[PDB]
Amino acid sequence: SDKICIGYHANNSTTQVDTLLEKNVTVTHSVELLENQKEKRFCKIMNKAPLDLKDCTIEGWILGNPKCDLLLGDQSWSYIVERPNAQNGICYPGVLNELEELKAFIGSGERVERFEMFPKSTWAGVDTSRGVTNACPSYTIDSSFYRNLVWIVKTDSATYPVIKGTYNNTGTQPILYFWGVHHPLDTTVQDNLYGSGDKYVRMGTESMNFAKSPEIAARPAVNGQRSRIDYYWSVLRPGETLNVESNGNLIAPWYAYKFVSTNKKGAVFKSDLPIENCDATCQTITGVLRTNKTFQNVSPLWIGECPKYVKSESLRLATGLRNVP
Amino acid sequence: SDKICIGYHANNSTTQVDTLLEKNVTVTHSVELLENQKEKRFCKIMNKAPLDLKDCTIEGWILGNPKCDLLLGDQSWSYIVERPNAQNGICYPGVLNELEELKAFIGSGERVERFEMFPKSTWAGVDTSRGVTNACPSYTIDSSFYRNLVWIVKTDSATYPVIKGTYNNTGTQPILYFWGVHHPLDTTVQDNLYGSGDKYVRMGTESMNFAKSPEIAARPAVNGQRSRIDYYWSVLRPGETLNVESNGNLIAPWYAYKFVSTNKKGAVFKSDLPIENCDATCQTITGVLRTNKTFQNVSPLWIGECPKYVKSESLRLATGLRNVP
Amino acid sequence: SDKICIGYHANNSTTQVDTLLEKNVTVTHSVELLENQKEKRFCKIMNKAPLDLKDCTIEGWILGNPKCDLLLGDQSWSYIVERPNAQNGICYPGVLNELEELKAFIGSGERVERFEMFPKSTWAGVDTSRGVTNACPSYTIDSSFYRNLVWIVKTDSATYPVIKGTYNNTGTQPILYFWGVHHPLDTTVQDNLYGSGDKYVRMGTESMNFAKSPEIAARPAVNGQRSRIDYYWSVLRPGETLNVESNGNLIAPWYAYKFVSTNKKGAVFKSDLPIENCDATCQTITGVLRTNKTFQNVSPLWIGECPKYVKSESLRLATGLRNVP
Amino acid sequence: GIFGAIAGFIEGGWTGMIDGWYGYHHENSQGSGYAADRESTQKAIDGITNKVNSIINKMNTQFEAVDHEFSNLERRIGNLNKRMEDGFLDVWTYNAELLVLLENERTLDLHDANVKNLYEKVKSQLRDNANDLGNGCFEFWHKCDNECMESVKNGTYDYPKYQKESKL
Amino acid sequence: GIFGAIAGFIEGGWTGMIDGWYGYHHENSQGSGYAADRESTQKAIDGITNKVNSIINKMNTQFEAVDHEFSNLERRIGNLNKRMEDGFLDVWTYNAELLVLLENERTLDLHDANVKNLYEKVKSQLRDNANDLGNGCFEFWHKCDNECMESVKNGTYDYPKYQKESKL
Amino acid sequence: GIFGAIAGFIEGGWTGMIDGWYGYHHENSQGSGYAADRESTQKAIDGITNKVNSIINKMNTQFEAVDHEFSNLERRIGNLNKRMEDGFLDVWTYNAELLVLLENERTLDLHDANVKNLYEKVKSQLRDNANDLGNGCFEFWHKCDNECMESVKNGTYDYPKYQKESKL
């Protein structure tokens, strides 16, 4: 007798999915929505390459630590790679004010142009040729100082005079700049370097005012210094002018950065991974992803277009039917 | 022979919906859950009207810039509309400390009552009627000063004496008040106005203490001033007392606001939209919404009860069946 | 004729569930997923006991208010229960700097060990035996002072000399410690206590520097005090060293806490509920929960492993059939 | 459609049927016309209405974004605030847009199913007393007057009283 | 009900049937009574159990709000913290309240489906040897004793041995 | 499976059928083999594809966590940032993991449903002209050549032309 039957597809598939009603269900066709593969390296993005701070910290780089000469000058970057146990940062002991807001502001950028903001010329009646210390050595001179700052002291002869400096930002770009205030360990060194008198460091901009006086005290020795420097930063906006004025204890700005900010969003990666000559559209702290998948369980930190991060190990959607072969 | 059939409704509808399995599906009945139309204006809320800050910034209004006289006195508001290109703010150059926390605290209110907190009488052996400047003109006197502050200077031939003032908030309402500290451009003007000696401005409250000294330096010219004033604000809570004491450089409180804070949430809108004589239950930064719909793609910023904001352009739920006509 | 029928279960159930299509639907079997019951008390969590600050505030406890002797010494705790109207806190009027970050850091802990960080010995040529006040009484001496601090003053007729102190944290644990700076109400009392001359209090560690000078002014009377003390705290990390140096107005550290804070989650409960001798795995601000249920509408604040907090009054999932009896 | 009835082994709907969503079209010697089934229609209306109102009710909260400004030294909390506000926006946008997609799929399924259950109720009564034609319709192999047409619609037909009938 | 079986072309359930969710009521010369179908009931139990445990498992995280205080100069982050905590609260509240509403609708559908599939299993065996009556029941056109009642329940009826009498 | 067809009153599938998801096994005097039904298969493919692409599209946003560091005096906002980022992570993880669980359940139902509707499509044509056997198969009571086999598959059989032989 003639037979006709109704039925459905099967194959040698063993790929399983889960449902609310049943776990481990074999189906004929499925699709994985989640990526968990990664090249373990850093690649360029928008073909712009990252900035490897190597054996420097952001602090070291942007203050101009002598041992960070490698990084000196102009820099372009798609993102920033800080290695976890980089040793060259703040050589001469002291606190960098608003460090976290600085590390974040720098992140929001993509290029800097180094430029002499205040020539040593600027400061009248003072010795800009000393201002050097073994807490801050180079690789060739075990007594140096930051490349973007000047430690101004009194001349052999005279009195530490009132000193003034001004800079009108006539350019199109905001300027990131730095200064400091020296806090000697005792009165003896205060007098040697800057002289008698109540000393001050004052700064001014259309939008901000800074003022501080030296805080003299011996503090625990760090790199053989029981003195300190309080470091500061700011952003001189386009059109604004900066006025400096002090009668002592000023670590003056010397070089500064013309800062162009990205309206992407940048990133600062603390990692051990190598930087290699490759492109990428998605780069995570733990590696680049190459995929069209919409989910990923690698890492929640990235730049570029990455898939949504989740804690699933698999997200497999069933497309075919139950497999019964 | 006789027929009976089973079937379903149809009509002249062409309204379509989407499903997981099929896009653009015509159905007999549907409902739109998302609102996307808006009157482009500002309206009354709980039938209290907003506060139109003129050509003011909050700063100008609340410190009492002469050109902000329109807004002087008591004020009630459901919210606050600040215009994007308002010109009268801080006339005499300087920084208003914790500006963002102030702009936010004011937002949390619904009325203020202006009142003389410290009469000029309060300050002994000092001149309270000079204290005036061309950086801060009226519309009729091209040299004036803030209406809630007093620029106190020494009399012609005497010395700037210790001056003291106290106010016990015996009322039920917190008081928002303001003061400042003058920072002259040089020593000459310091001596003109206050005499010399180390000057100070000190304040005290059961819960706070303020103390600062003038930081004398020439800064970039703003409204023809290379001097500065650091402005400050605070809230004298009910029951407490405020003590003022200075020997120079004090911009003293004069008037202040009895502040009554909101139980709802407040808002501060930066916009160009007109304020008109209408009510509303939902008012967004870009316009009032009139609807019962539960979704809306206009704006995430509002006051009153608005629908949930989403980025969808449509959310239409199917109620009827597929239309096959 | 013989009949066989197909059908389904029914029972005396009146328990109802809701569906998208129909509210109040009686079903044969269901399960409640949401807990709304709570023992109204505080219990041990992981057998660890809470710390009842009783009639002290955190401030009072950790500064060593005399009336807080009950809490003096070593302490272990699962969380911290501060009662809402505790009256023993900062006896001598003044602000505890970064109070909120302190209240948070302490919350981040589970035990402290009290220990003499700076013996009264440490400070040469000064009277450490007065430094006591009626604003800060004991239960037996109506004029005392904090147990973790020393109010150092001048000896009868010598002058307040430079005083120095150092402590090297050689232990494995971070040290939470405290100091202050006295702000007299006038010049007369300044000279009584510390002598004339511009005074200072300076502190130092490898990672931080502190320096401030007395701010002399009369401020509203609190516990009969028109002077003030600014209190400060910090954490001396393992390996770090602290240098103290002043010539007046120093409220010196005396005792401090070896602070061990694990990778918890910590809590500080502001509540009146009794602490009783019970265990618990889930403890909320409004009571302990005992349940296997995955949801709960009691409170979003807890420690231990609690169910997810939601605003539902019921979440009943249907397991059985529609009940038609 | 998933149950097979709407568009369909029952191709096309009836513009003629105005008083409901599901029902009957009859033809006999006494006349012809269209008549909805109110019990299945009403029980559907209540369902869909409850679904819509439920969704509306459950969607009746609003995340509220905020005015507040942030200084040049507050890049971090500033950016934290935007990331949070965008975060909830993207979540609720997903929840709403997908819910619509899902429920719309299931809404159509429901109508499909209740048409089918009507088709099979009638089929369960008539049996051999009708020839199917496999398109929702039923040719009576016997004479079905209007009291017989209601017979079928109220679910009380009487297969015996017409077993004489379809004999031929 | 979506599959048409529960409340229902099979109006009402059986309080008499205590040992399961779905099953049979028979009557013959030897007596009458109720007997559950364990295979279909048990796989229903495992299904629903797996669903419940899945929901529980997938819901087994907690967003946790926090103690922390904020000064009078910290209105902004304070309010940010409040908005965030309320934000997640409103999200999880929605996810839970709606999931319950949805799954409850679908749970009932499942039971409805499992009854229908029992109905059609039996119908597939009995054929002509039974008259339907369209209400879950089956009148035998032949004589069905108790092992004949079990024949039907264990799914080994036989169409074979009762055509003879189906005739009659 | 909820419609009862897949694993199943039709236990097991056909590895032999390679050109589709659903279809036919025929056997007659002229030969035998397997042939998919592409219309039901294709509109299923379009369905599932649209479902997958919809899910992908609606899931096509990303919450973005951030580098930023926080000082030892910023425990509170620090922890706030941590709680927020974990908060959205846990939310999206839930949304994705549960959506998969749900849609997979409903995907299988659809396939189950489409098979059933094929089974009943054929059963609707043959009627008396076939013996069921209740497992997807149909024995013809008449002689069905290949043009007759296509007759059944394109949905144009003709019960009249083989009624003659089926009685016999």
Ligand SMILES: *[C@@H]1O[C@H](CO)[C@@H](O)[C@H](O)[C@H]1NC(C)=O
């Ligand atoms: C599985 O069967 C497929 C049918 O598509 C065949 O092409 C393939 O080679 C087989 N693979 C294995 C591993 O058995």
Ligand SMILES: *[C@@H]1O[C@H](CO)[C@@H](O)[C@H](O)[C@H]1NC(C)=O
């Ligand atoms: C399927 O079951 C196996 C063991 O039978 C298990 O190892 C695997 O994890 C299960 N699938 C998934 C996705 O977990």
Ligand SMILES: *[C@@H]1O[C@H](CO)[C@@H](O)[C@H](O)[C@H]1NC(C)=O
């Ligand atoms: C469409 O149908 C409605 C009734 O549902 C009717 O009122 C309206 O006039 C119709 N439109 C046209 C153009 O015929």
Ligand SMILES: *[C@@H]1O[C@H](CO)[C@@H](O)[C@H](O)[C@H]1NC(C)=O
């Ligand atoms: C239906 O598709 C058309 C394009 O063919 C599009 O213009 C329209 O927006 C779609 N309908 C909806 C409701 O999105």
Ligand SMILES: *[C@@H]1O[C@H](CO)[C@@H](O)[C@H](O)[C@H]1NC(C)=O
């Ligand atoms: C403020 O005034 C009230 C009088 O009603 C008094 O009780 C309180 O002590 C006063 N405060 C001060 C600091 O004088």
Ligand SMILES: *[C@@H]1O[C@H](CO)[C@@H](O)[C@H](O)[C@H]1NC(C)=O
């Ligand atoms: C800066 O320079 C421009 C002219 O190049 C001028 O408009 C402005 O006055 C200058 N600012 C100052 C403070 O000199």
Ligand SMILES: *[C@@H]1O[C@H](CO)[C@@H](O)[C@H](O)[C@H]1NC(C)=O
């Ligand atoms: C409900 O039914 C149970 C059996 O399931 C029976 O034992 C009990 O007495 C009944 N009780 C109530 C309150 O209905």
Ligand SMILES: *[C@@H]1O[C@H](CO)[C@@H](O)[C@H](O)[C@H]1NC(C)=O
């Ligand atoms: C059910 O409805 C009754 C009133 O009919 C009401 O009292 C009860 O709160 C409702 N319960 C649920 C779970 O919906």
Ligand SMILES: *[C@@H]1O[C@H](CO)[C@@H](O)[C@H](O)[C@H]1NC(C)=O
């Ligand atoms: C602290 O003690 C250790 C070991 O005793 C020593 O190596 C270190 O130099 C000390 N620190 C200071 C600042 O003396």
